[PDB]
Amino acid sequence: LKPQVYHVDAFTSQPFRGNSAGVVFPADNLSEAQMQLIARELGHSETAFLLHSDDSDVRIRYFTPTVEVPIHATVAAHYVRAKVLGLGNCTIWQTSLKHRVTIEKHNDDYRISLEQGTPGFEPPLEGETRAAIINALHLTEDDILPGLPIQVATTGHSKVMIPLKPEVDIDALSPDLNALTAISKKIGCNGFFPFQIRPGKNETDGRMFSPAIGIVEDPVTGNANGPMGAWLVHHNVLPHDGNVLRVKGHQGRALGRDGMIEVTVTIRDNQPEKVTISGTAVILFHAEWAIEL
Amino acid sequence: ESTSLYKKAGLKPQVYHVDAFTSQPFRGNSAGVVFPADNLSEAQMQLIARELGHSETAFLLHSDDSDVRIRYFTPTVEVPICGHATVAAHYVRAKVLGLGNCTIWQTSLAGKHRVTIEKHNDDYRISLEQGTPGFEPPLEGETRAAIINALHLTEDDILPGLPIQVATTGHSKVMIPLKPEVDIDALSPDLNALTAISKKIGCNGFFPFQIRPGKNETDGRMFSPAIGIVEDPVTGNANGPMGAWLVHHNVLPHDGNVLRVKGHQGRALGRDGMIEVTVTIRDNQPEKVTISGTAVILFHAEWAIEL
């Protein structure tokens, strides 16, 4: 009933791993300035504030330490909400600046599934742009998965797909961040997602670099892994039954912030129609605010 | 007569989120405090400090040769001791243990420090003794001009008859005395030029400040881009030396025994804070520097995970 603050690691079961987020609940009597102040104070890359909706179950506003942003803190918010309310195996609808969410409960723990936006792809990056991206990661053409493009994919917040051979030491990558930033201005995408596929498995390991927006590396990124799953279907990279492809995306190992996202792609005529991402989380602690508001 | 540590603080570690050098939430200088922290391993402390994301988190331990032992960690490494985190730490402990007015001893990697606790109307003020005051020779010539140019000021903005000068009580800072007419909040330094100057002079922090007319009070800003911190909200390590420097240059009036200065810092950052600097004086030179501050606990809780 009183404002509480939750410190949550999203897309993991292990404390101190995953992608940390704040959740403040309930946030009904906070102004935009108060929410911005709290987000700055907690210092997570994102803090979620959960409120009452008159046409849904929940409205959520997300703030970085400096500015409001859109719909990992989503998984955190709904995990917290499920735990506090004692939610069951149900469907929830989110309004925020109408998004379908599913909650599953196994063993007194929760998994949260978010349906993403329409999959889409931009024309492949070829020639000098391709070579510029490869050189910025300090790789060569021989490091790239043969016959496949470097290419922006999206389910609502676009990312550059960079398909690497399994032989590549993805954890040793240390990109030229200024060069990535210069490329971002030419291609209209701020996030770069090198990833590789585990041999014989519908599983991947990736890293998401986004220096153009001040985030050098994001530990676990739903908006990268979702489009990667769509992309794998679109370029027929992983075997599937033509109906559903499930990929377990791993991210964050080099940061000591290992996380996991399950990506489920619905398939029609061998093209990705819909993408859902799912993950769990762990609450490290929660408290009532000891101060007024 | 026991503090009854585990009765009052509990048997399980709690995290406290504290703003130091202020009584206003969301202002001052934030620090994590973990209390009690006994039996947490070093690896766990480093992970918790990374997780909380403050500039420092302090871990309060039982001590065999003092009232309390404190370990300090940034997000990446253990450090010997930290001013604002020391204030946060002792504020938490005083309030949780229900302490009155006392003088106690703490132990850390930096040795044995005396700490004074004052209680007035259920609130607390913490006082810490800093290291030996010293000064390096004033910066003149190219160096003075380049510091001034890097703040986008001119010679006309510097307080007449006073040097730009490195002062220290343990962690040195460049004192840059400004006229009261200077709009300190609008300063936007050329950060690359400051870093280059830091390399040349062997000092990683710059402290432009001004004196409020007719008062023993100052407003300052601490820029330290050479060590990756562009601006620190409230810095005991700048304000303490400032106090000593004011005595050494006989800038403010005093009774020949003590100078008390209320230092203000962090307004431009939206993180206003206040440090009271007490300088003991002998023959018009600074002998001893003490800083004092309060704090506010935003929230606290036991961990939901097993540690």
UniProtKB/Swiss-Prot annotation, chain B:
<dbReference type="GO" id="GO:0042803">
    <property type="term" value="F:protein homodimerization activity"/>
</dbReference>
<protein>
    <recommendedName>
        <fullName>Uncharacterized isomerase YddE</fullName>
        <ecNumber>5.1.-.-</ecNumber>
    </recommendedName>
</protein>
<comment type="subunit">
    <text>Homodimer and homotetramer.</text>
</comment>
<comment type="similarity">
    <text>Belongs to the PhzF family.</text>
</comment>
<feature type="active site">
    <location>
        <position position="56"/>
    </location>
</feature>
<dbReference type="GO" id="GO:0009058">
    <property type="term" value="P:biosynthetic process"/>
</dbReference>
<dbReference type="GO" id="GO:0016853">
    <property type="term" value="F:isomerase activity"/>
</dbReference>
<dbReference type="Pfam" id="PF02567">
    <property type="entry name" value="PhzC-PhzF"/>
</dbReference>
<keyword id="KW-0413">Isomerase</keyword>
<dbReference type="GO" id="GO:0005737">
    <property type="term" value="C:cytoplasm"/>
</dbReference>
<dbReference type="InterPro" id="IPR003719">
    <property type="entry name" value="Phenazine_PhzF-like"/>
</dbReference>
